[PDB]
Structure formats: structure tokens, C-alpha cells
DNA sequence: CGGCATACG
DNA sequence: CGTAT
DNA sequence: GCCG
């Protein structure tokens, strides 16, 4: 009734076990702050299973037979059902370690490893970092200066305005090039913390060298608050606001049209969905999947895809639209 | 017990 | 090390 | 932390 891989089941954006999934994802996040990638994955998977259910979990027995629910995740659900709260989850929420690692990792340019080192040095607040800017990278200085704006959700109305200015710059850099909205917004999200665009051109090869030309034109228009040959660009855009503006994170990605279905699939997510899809491809089908293609290691050949539908078919999976990939 | 996705900047 | 889904 |  419940397949083991998230890519084998539709997962809508809104579901019937929000509180339970949120608690398990706290534990997944905390596992990540401690470098326990294995425990992070299990908690993430257990959370996604609940997102895929057709109704609320009301009794512990309803977890029987569900994949990725063992003693620990089941105990978390049990306590939430009996008391509306899970002691372990609440201890994590208020712990100084969790709050600081979460605060530091959400800085653009700060990963788990950097946040952990700063934590061990006694640092706890953003102003602690600001007072010692000599130890910050140029990327981290940008992320810290813009941290407040980058914490404000991006609205779908913002996305439309950004896509227009991106299309304009893309149109001058390479006539005929196209811009596709990807990421969480393509999955139907109404808010987000960044906007993701995928750029290609219908004539194979014409996209080569395109991203530097796009970036230089965006910068000349005064729209780039920060950015680093290349095919991925992690920028901070200047988004007009009523009587002012705000900083917004935008990712620009280029792919040749031959690889466009794979890049669209990869960059549409969710993150967990893509990990599960690549895991499923390798372990169940013996095929190697990434955002560039799908490789058969036996015949040493790449699978040609003209659409996401092609890719699902070549993996023996039923097609899922982006709005059902919210694992 | 091994494995846990796979890239690019 | 960071970034991305 | 859980699966095969
Ligand atoms: Mg995104
Ligand atoms: Mg992004
Ligand atoms: Na970060």
C-alpha cells in the first residue's frame, strides 16, 4: 500500500499529517547538525511517508507496515498522539545547539561544518559574526548583510516580476533562449526562500557560454546585489518593492536542450524526491541518474529523453507531475 | 553489516 | 569549503 | 534510523 521509495508515490504539497511530519523533520534537521546523514535520511523518509497518506494518522497501529517507521519514529508519533508533544523534539527545539546551528546554517555561505566550528568557538548570534568580519568569506559577508531580507518569504507575485527581467536579459544574451521556472514554485508552492530558473536554447550548442553573458547584463542593469565559464549562478537579486526594494536569492542554471529534461527533473525537486529517485534508479534499475542524463553502465550508453515523462518511463515509474513530487 | 544522490562554484 | 534540487 |  505504501512503496518504500518516495519517487514511487504521489506526495502533495499539503496533506493530512502536517504536525507529525514537522516533528520528524526537526529530528532530521538536528541529525544533520551533528553529521548523522543516515539518521537524517530515515527521519526525512518517515516524514515524507506521512505526507503521502490519504488521511490523518490517529492511532499507533496505523503505522504498522509503513516503511521507515521503526522504534524511534514510531515512539515520536506515539507521544504526539497521546500528549500532543514529543519530549525529545521539544528538547531539540529549545537547545542552544539546535537554535544556533539553525541560525548559522541559514546564512548564505555558511554550511554545517562552518557553523559547527563557530559554535565550538563560543559564537552564538549574528552580531557575534559581524563583530569579527575578518574571518568571513566574501560570500558569507553578503549572506550576513542581506540575512534579514533573505529570511522574508518570496511570494509568487515576486517570481513573475523576476522572470520577466531574467527573460529580458536572456533575450539579449541569446535570442531564442528560454527561461523555465523550476524549484519549489514549479511544485506549486505559494511562498519560498529563493527562485530557481532553468535556461536553455532549442538549438543544441547555442547555450554554450550563455550564463556569463546573462550575468553581465543583469549586473549592468543594476539588479545583482551579489554573485560569484560556468553553468550555475547563485545570485542575490534586487527586487523592487513599494517605494523601495528587497534582496532575493535567485538561482540561474543553463543546460543544453538534449539534457533539459534531466535538468528540469533535477531542479524541480524536491531534494528528497531526487535523492530517492537517484537511489531507486541505481539500486533497483542499475541505472545512474543525475541532472545531466541517465547512464546505463552495462551498455555504456546514455538514455535520450525528450521530456520528464520519458525519464519516468525509462525508470519503470508511473509519471508524477511536479505538484506530486513534494516528498 | 553496508548503504544512504549527485552534481557544480 | 560553499552552493543546488 | 531504518531496509534489504
Ligand atoms: Mg528553490
Ligand atoms: Mg535555489
Ligand atoms: Na547556508
Measured CA to C1', the nucleotide nearest A37 is: B4
Q: Reduced to 3 states, what is the DSSP secondary structure of residue A95?
A: coil
Cell 563583530 belongs to residue? A131
* Domain ranges in chain A with CATH number 3.30.210.10: 258-326
Q: Reduced to 3 states, what is the DSSP secondary structure of residue A262?
A: helix
Contacts of A157 (CB under 8 A, 6+ apart): none
Contacts of A298 (CB under 8 A, 6+ apart): A286
Tell me whether residue A289 is exposed, middle or buried, using C-beta atoms within 10 angstroms of its C-beta: 0 to 12, 13 to 18, 19 or more.
buried
Fold held by A1-95 = DNA polymerase; domain 1 (1.10.150)
8 A C-beta contact, residue A40 and residue A26: no
Method: X-ray
Cα separations in angstroms, A77 against A19, A30, A66, A86 = 10, 17, 13, 8
Q: What is the DSSP letter of A67?
A: T
Q: Which of A184, A179, A155, A181 is nearest to A325 (CA)?
A: A184
Long-range contacts of A71-75 (CB under 8 A, 24+ apart): A73/A24, A73/A42, A73/A43, A73/A46
8 A C-beta contact, residue A146 and residue A247: yes
Q: Give CATH superfamily name and number for A258-326.
A: DNA polymerase, thumb domain (3.30.210.10)
Report the first-to-last Cα separation within chain A, whole angstroms. 17
Cα separations in angstroms, A41 against A2, A56, A119 = 17, 23, 24
Phi (first) and psi of residue A203, to 5 degrees: -100, 110
Separation of A255 CA and B7 C1' (Å): 13
Give the strand pairing for A195-200 and A244-254.
parallel
Q: Give the DSSP letter string of A231-292.
A: SEEEEEEEEEETTEEEEEEEEEEE--TTTHHHHHHHHHS-HHHHHHHHHHHHHHH--EEETT
Annotated catalytic residue, options A116, A127, A128, A194: A194
Phi-psi category of residue A65: left, alpha or beta, with phi > 0 → left and psi -120 to 50 → alpha: left
Determine whether the annotation assigns residue A149 to a binding site. Answer: no
Give the ligand whose atoms come closest to the C-alpha of residue A183: 1
Contacts of A18 (CB under 8 A, 6+ apart): none
Which residues hold their Cβ within 5 A of ligand 2, which is an ion?
A 194, 196, 251
Measured CA to C1', the nucleotide nearest A272 is: C5
A143 Cα to the center of ligand 3, angstroms: 8
8 A C-beta contact, residue A255 and residue A232: no
Tell me the structure's resolution in angstroms, rounded to a single decimal.
2.0
8 A C-beta contact, residue A81 and residue A58: yes
**Annotation says A251 is catalytic:** yes
Other CB atoms within a 10 A radius of the CB of residue A77 amount to 23
Q: Please give the Cα distance from A297 to A174 (Å, whole number).
A: 36
Q: Please give the Cα distance from A164 to A120 (Å, whole number).
A: 45
Cα separations in angstroms, A13 against A188, A206, A270, A324 = 7, 36, 10, 7
Contacts of A194 (CB under 8 A, 6+ apart): A154, A183, A248, A249, A250, A251
Please tell us whether the domain made up of A153-257 is placed in CATH 3.30.460.10. Answer: yes
Give the ligand whose atoms come closest to the C-alpha of residue A113: 3
Cell 529580458 belongs to residue? A168
CATH architecture of structural domain A96-152: Orthogonal Bundle (1.10)
Which residues hold their Cβ within 5 A of ligand 1, which is an ion?
A 183-184, 194, 196
Which residues of the protein are close to the nucleic strand D, CB under 7 angstroms?
A 4, 38-39, 41-43, 46, 67-74
Determine whether the annotation assigns residue A251 to a binding site. Answer: yes
Separation of A327 CA and B3 C1' (Å): 21
A235 Cα to the center of ligand 2, angstroms: 9
Tell me whether residue A37 is exposed, middle or buried, using C-beta atoms within 10 angstroms of its C-beta: 0 to 12, 13 to 18, 19 or more.
exposed
* Domain ranges in chain A with CATH number 1.10.150.110: 1-95
Q: Please give the Cα distance from A66 to A70 (Å, whole number).
A: 9
8 A C-beta contact, residue A326 and residue A13: yes
Q: Please give the Cα distance from A7 to A278 (Å, whole number).
A: 9
A130 Cα to the center of ligand 2, angstroms: 25
Determine whether the annotation assigns residue A158 to a binding site. Answer: no
Amino acid at each position: 500500500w505504501m512503496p518504500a521509495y518516495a519517487c514511487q508515490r504521489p506526495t502533495p504539497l499539503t496533506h493530512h499529517n502536517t504536525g507529525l511530519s514537522e516533528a520528524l523533520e526537526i529530528l532530521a534537521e538536528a541529525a544533520g547538525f551533528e553529521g548523522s546523514e543516515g539518521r537524517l535520511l530515515t527521519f526525512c523518509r518517515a516524514a515524507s511517508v506521512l505526507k503521502a497518506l490519504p488521511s490523518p494518522v490517529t492511532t499507533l497501529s496505523q503505522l504498522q507496515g509503513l516503511p521507515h517507521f521503526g522504534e524511534h519514529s514510531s515512539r515520536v508519533v506515539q507521544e504526539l498522539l497521546e500528549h500532543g508533544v514529543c519530549e525529545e523534539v521539544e528538547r531539540v527545539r529549545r537547545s542552544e545547539r539546535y537554535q544556533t546551528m539553525k541560525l548559522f546554517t541559514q546564512i548564505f555561505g555558511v554550511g554545517v561544518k562552518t557553523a559547527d566550528r563557530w559554535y565550538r568557538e563560543g559564537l552564538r548570534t549574528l552580531d557575534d559574526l559581524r563583530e569579527q568580519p575578518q574571518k568571513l568569506t566574501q560570500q558569507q559577508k553578503a549572506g550576513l548583510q542581506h540575512h534579514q531580507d533573505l529570511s522574508t518569504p518570496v511570494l509568487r507575485s515576486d517570481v513573475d516580476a523576476l522572470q520577466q527581467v531574467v527573460e529580458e536579459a536572456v533575450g539579449q544574451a541569446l535570442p531564442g533562449a528560454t527561461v523555465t521556472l523550476t524549484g519549489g514554485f514549479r511544485r506549486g508552492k505559494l511562498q519560498g526562500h529563493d527562485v530557481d530558473f532553468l535556461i536553455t536554447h532549442p538549438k543544441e550548442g547555442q547555450e554554450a557560454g550563455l550564463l556569463p553573458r546573462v550575468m553581465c547584463r543583469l549586473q549592468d542593469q543594476g539588479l545583482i546585489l551579489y554573485h560569484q565559464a560556468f553553468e550555475r549562478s547563485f545570485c542575490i537579486f534586487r527586487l523592487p518593492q513599494p517605494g523601495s526594494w528587497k534582496a532575493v536569492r535567485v538561482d540561474l542554471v543553463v543546460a543544453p536542450v538534449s539534457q533539459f529534461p534531466f535538468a528540469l527533473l533535477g531542479w524541480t525537486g524536491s531534494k528528497l524526491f531526487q535523492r530517492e529517485l537517484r537511489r531507486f534508479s541505481r539500486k533497483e534499475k542499475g541505472l545512474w541518474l543525475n541532472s545531466h542524463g541517465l547512464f546505463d553502465p552495462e551498455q555504456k550508453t546514455f538514455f535520450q529523453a525528450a521530456s520528464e515523462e520519458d525519464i519516468f518511463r525509462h525508470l519503470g515509474l508511473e509519471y508524477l507531475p511536479p505538484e506530486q513530487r513534494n516528498a
